[PDB]
Amino acid sequence: DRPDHIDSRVWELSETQEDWITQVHGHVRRVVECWKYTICCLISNMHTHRGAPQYDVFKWQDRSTIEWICSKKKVQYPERDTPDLYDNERAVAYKVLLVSDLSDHSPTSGIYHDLAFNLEGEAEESCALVLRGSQLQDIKGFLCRALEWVVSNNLTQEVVETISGEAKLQFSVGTTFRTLLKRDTDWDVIPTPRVEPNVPRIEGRRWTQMKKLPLLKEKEGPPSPWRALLLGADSEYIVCPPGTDQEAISWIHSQSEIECIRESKSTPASVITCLTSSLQSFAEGNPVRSRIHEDIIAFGINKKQEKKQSASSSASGEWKRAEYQVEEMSLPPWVEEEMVLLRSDQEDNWIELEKNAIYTEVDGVAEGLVDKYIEIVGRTKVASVIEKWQIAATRTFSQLHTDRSRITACPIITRDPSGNCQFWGMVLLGPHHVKRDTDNAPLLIAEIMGEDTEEKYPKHSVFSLKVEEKQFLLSLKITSFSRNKLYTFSNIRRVLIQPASIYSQVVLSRAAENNSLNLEVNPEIQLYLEGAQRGMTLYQWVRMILCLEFLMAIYNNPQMEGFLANMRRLHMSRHAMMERRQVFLPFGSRPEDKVNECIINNPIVAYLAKGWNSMPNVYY
Amino acid sequence: MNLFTPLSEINPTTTQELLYAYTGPAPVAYGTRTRAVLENIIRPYQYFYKEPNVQRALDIKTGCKEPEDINVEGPSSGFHTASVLKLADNFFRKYRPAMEKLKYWILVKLPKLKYAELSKGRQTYSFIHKRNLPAPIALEETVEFLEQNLRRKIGPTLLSYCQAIADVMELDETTYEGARDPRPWDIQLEEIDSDEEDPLFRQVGREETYTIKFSREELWDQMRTLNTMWKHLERGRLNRRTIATPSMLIRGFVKIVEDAAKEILENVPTSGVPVGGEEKLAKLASKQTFHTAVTGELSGDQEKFNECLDPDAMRLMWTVFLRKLGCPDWIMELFNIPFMVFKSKLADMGEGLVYTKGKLTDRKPLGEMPSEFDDLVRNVVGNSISCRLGMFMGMYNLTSTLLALISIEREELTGSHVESSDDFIHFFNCKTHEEMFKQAETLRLTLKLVGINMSPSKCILISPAGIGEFNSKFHHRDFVGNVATELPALVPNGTNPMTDLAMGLNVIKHSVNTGQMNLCTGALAMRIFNHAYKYAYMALGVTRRTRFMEENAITPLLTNQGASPVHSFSTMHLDEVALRRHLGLLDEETLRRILNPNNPVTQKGDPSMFFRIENKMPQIMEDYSVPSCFKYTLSRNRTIQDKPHKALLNKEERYQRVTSIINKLFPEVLIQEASAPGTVRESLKRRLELVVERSDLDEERKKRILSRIF
Amino acid sequence: ECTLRALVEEYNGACKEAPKEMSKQFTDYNTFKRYTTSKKDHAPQMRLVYSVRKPWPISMTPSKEIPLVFNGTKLKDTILDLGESKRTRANIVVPDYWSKYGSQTSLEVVNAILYAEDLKVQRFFSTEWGEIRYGRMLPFRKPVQACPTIEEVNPASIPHTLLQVFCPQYTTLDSKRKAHMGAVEKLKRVMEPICKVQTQESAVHIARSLIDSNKKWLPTVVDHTPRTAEMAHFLCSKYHYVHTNIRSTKFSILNSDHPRIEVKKVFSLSPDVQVTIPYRRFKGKAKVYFQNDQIQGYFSCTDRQIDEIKISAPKNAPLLEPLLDICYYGSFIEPGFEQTFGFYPAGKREFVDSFFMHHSKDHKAFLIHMGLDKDLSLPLSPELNWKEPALSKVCRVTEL
RNA sequence: AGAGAAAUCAAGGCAGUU
RNA sequence: GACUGCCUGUUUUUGCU
């Protein structure tokens, strides 16, 4: 596209000086700028005085070296108005300014002495004086030779337009792109609908008042089992002589007898050999052990191939759309006993968090409230269960190489203040190659029980454990736990924050009303317990809030998330009516239908729904 | 739920914190997104007519309908053209400063918008590799494609990029001529960069040429095509939704439109989508000086927001604003391209609907075998399906809020409205309850006029104002902080100990400032985060780090090293290193080692860094932790090997080499953008002779340095 | 010189190994500075635990101070990490190994890197707190400058000030004019030991931190200062409150026939939206003596036209903005008083700032309204600077 | 088996021999 | 078939605004 009368070097140099594609007649402007650059480079063609070239060109040079040369000359030129070329022989600057009229002798600027040509060669009189005759002849030649190019390509209007004014932005959509754009719309690129602007008057429906709070449905079916990974409230520990983890696992492996009381079909009783081998290996000193014949059944090794082969063998011949059904199970009766056992009082503090520094009395107040909260919710079964969950999750996630093909043992061992070891159970990591966020790592968790149920633990195989005349119950389950869930249960201690937030709000509000912090307040809080309005003391309330939050966290399925999201609205409406305020709804507004869809099989959502529907539904 | 509703002391609204199952397993998506994609595509067509008739609706290009066609009872996709025109005119008549700032942005800010802003995004669909790639890589490949096919140089401005995209489609056939690695299974090692008793080896890479050809129709399809993905870790819904990403050939246009919407919405008082625009709702709520009048509060949400929204409505609104402002024709020819392209959108179908035969399942395309989506078979283009009505994904949230706000501006509606995409809240201030009901129904009908379609079961009106919600921020005579909303952000990040601690402290401080945390909650959060920090970085119990420090007499001096806590509640803003220096925990001997610039382990970064809580709105934090030896970076993932497209490694290493030669000769691109016109080679050359000539050396030495340059 | 030779060698290597990438435009650096295939920012919280425990879990540039094996532990790997030009992998203990058996640096370098952080720590441990007072406080969020600054700078002048601090030679006259001379020397003095090509990347961030005035939204119960804004997390809350402890010119109207008249002007954005902004104007004859640091002088006032100005200034001392203020009080130049800048304004603050920036970018109005002549005895030049060699000097100006 | 919920994981690719 | 060796555990079509 380069004109033959323009040098290739100056063309490639001017290619990117200014954006020529988004300018009105950008090609003509580029040609004009190439004209000016060829005029200035054509000037000072081997011309020199002293020991340096007579003229220095500033157009289209790096601005850093331009400033350097100007600093050598002890003169400063701005960017928005910089001369074309500077003459050091006469110590004056110049700018090539092509003008068609040639009668515009008026200087464009006073900083630099301007020079002009008439587009066919003739220069202004001072321009003729300040330049040598050979330079004038060369400019004549270039202007005439560009004039034939202008005439041949009939651009005589665009050239004068560009040398007259400045650049104008444009953005043009071609004819081919326009049709493709307009393929799928009735309107054109610039929508011009031929309709009179007005707002129609549309008739709607009346707004109804929600006189009574919605009643959540209660599904009917078999009781829901314990689907959590660990055991929860029905989890106990074995006291061991003080020492390291291996020094306790060896003690357990030596002084114990294992017999099967219960054998579930989900977890065969033959997987106990894997557990015994894992304990033996961990006792010897190597936590990681090789595979055994029972490990295939224990961790489902090569189960995908077997299931695929069986499915290929068993065929029907319809190829229908897959319809996945989710079984509906009612509220199990063990939720209440779990909530009442998780609130029981232990003897030791099970929340050991390192104290923060205290430099300002604001922190001393802050750490006092945290210490009191830990005192309230530490000596409690739920705190011990949170602890055991955290060790079970972290000692597996951390030693989850995430790329391994051998069985790994991760004991769940804690320590009491007296130093005695506490063997809650063992987690057996299996061959895992999880990459996606939905991949499941095979697990075989053995856990110490307190009481078997067979309607709460249907997939758990219960074994009888005898250690120094003491009879415990050992439960083995086969689970597959994803990396995301292991990650989120490694930070299970975060659940303490919400009841801590509630307790902090209560205490700080009491301090605000009394204008003084007490930190020993035990407020009486009224609640709808067993239907009637009874009261608690914020100590067992916060404790059972902690237990409920822990149960919600370990049972956090999409059903629970949707139920809570659609239940916050109903709770807000309950608050609104409790303040003698009336609630109105649009026409087809049934806010309980978005909640009833999330009550399917989760036990905690059923417990929450039963708690909701036991409350008064109308506030007179 | 009976334990979450106190009847004394604190209010139930303060217990909305307990209504979150966070700190538990976030729901994750399994299998194929194709069913969700087809559902989200068939929903706009089902909602067009009052009586569901998909087949007739599939022949509608512009979702303009008569006023009597709007289903006042249920979702209704489409808009009324005259209503859109009049509502846009009413919106323009008010908020004149916003329109003037829009004009300023158009004629002072738009001309110098650089296309390099496209590289600050995230994963985009690549029309060359047919996969999702990082935004810089896609931008580089598409710029190379345009330069090769148009045979010119792309200007630094985004306008030049858009003009190049507009001009490349004028061509008939296009080619790319990329690079591939012939055999990614033949890793070969060479001994380079070191031979002195410590040999260093770097992998070598072989290269070939793609030489792939695109026709006009194929390139247009790739521009139309928007790749679809599952929305993993979506907290708050029982049913998993689907996100999508457009190509790189429409993203510049989209950015122009979204920036225009940003400088419109940041100046109107009815918008909450500004980041600083969610704090005006506190001012509206505190504006409770009603003179004993019926003042309600309607907090709600919109159903099928991305489905019942026709791009032509917001296109018309944009062209109305631009025509009443006085902008030239090309301005309205630039703001209308994105909406006309997404009018012809080609949603990428998944890997196929799940068809089962007994127990085994097969993944079959939409066309093969009958399913529920038999009406959309006529819209299948390869593995992608077209859908004219609906947005299908939220690339336009700002202009969608703009449409919802121009809907607000009537004469009957005399209340206060706040709009943030889906969630919204209205503050009626009327004289009688009948007037309030009429205004609420007028609001509903007007949002249905342009297709906003509030969900009936999600909007609740309280006749005495004071109780409501907006973006998980509950209001009871004031807005109560919700600690639950940010709990997933208290887990330490995964970059390096210093940045992780800085982000943890900054998150806790931000939660305290916003009111979501207080003294005890913040202190407990810090104590939990400290233990999570120490465990995650091998500083608890017996580990490899503790062992290496034990049999080397390396005492722990940092929190990540297992030392005692140094950060108190009053000092989340302070940095660990300076705080330990002032308190006398770090001596000068250790400081001159960990802060030594000659560290081989430290990785340079930026104070501002990407922060996303969990698949939520991206956020920007401040990383003021000093670059000590503990500010490192993790090892690069190596899944890229055994893949044909591993040649991107060679290109990125060459680009790192070029970035290393820059930043050493140009001590200005660290402060501002690059603006020198020309190639990298020429600029580096000229700067080299400038730096050698500006130095203080002998003339012959300068000449020999020049001679050694080639 | 050694560094120049190394730069030449690196340039030659860049030309040789990467010829295609070096043929790209310079403006593409804004895009390929980030060209990486890494996805280390896509939910990194879920990968931290097993990624720092993985063999070779760190990235380290090759170096000689790190032995291959130290006391039986393999510290570093001999294979460069994929996609990384000059970095390899190492063991996670290398950061701990360097903390004791590592090289040292200058004490001044440590202070330079730890400047802003140590300033914040001293500010924290330099004030006396009050007594925590509990009450039902009402906190309202207000935009407040969070981090205290060494000197107040405009948000637009920060890049130019930083360019002056680090690369005063690679800058334009316009950028120098837009700088904030007065805070550049403080930054230079406190930053000199770290202004090296090795540490220029980390120096710019810490220099911006001392100079940036980011306006965060923070709760307050009393009007905070810049000092008591970075500490708002523990001084105010919903329950407790601890009680902690023309531009730059002088006018001196002196002799004046009439006082400064105020002609209120109404700019109509619309028949229904209008903005009223009055401007000060001198009526008749006045004699006003100004002063700005080391430059002083007085000018005559003939209606709204500058009759004559004379100044005493050091030689080659910039004088653009002082005479711009002079034109501001008196309304001697337009646009900026009577007609808009092409766009209708909002407030007087925005209007005066726009008047400053537009006329500092281009001072053509002052020259066209003020007077130009062809001689040499005139003191200043069209660029508004004192005695210098120049042409077409500004007329109607004498010495004092 | 199990995890699980509207469909997936229960290792997957590549080179050589076969 | 399977059967030897190599590789990958975010980069496999999957965290957009």
Ligand SMILES: Nc1nc2c(ncn2[C@@H]2O[C@H](COP(=O)(O)CP(=O)(O)OP(=O)(O)O)[C@@H](O)[C@H]2O)c(=O)[nH]1
């Ligand atoms: N670009 C994005 N927009 C999002 C994202 N998440 C939500 N949104 C926005 O939120 C809206 C999507 O909500 P839906 O269309 O599902 C409407 P609702 O919330 O009422 O859900 P349903 O009742 O189930 O239809 C829409 O405005 C989106 O742009 C996201 O990850 N990216």
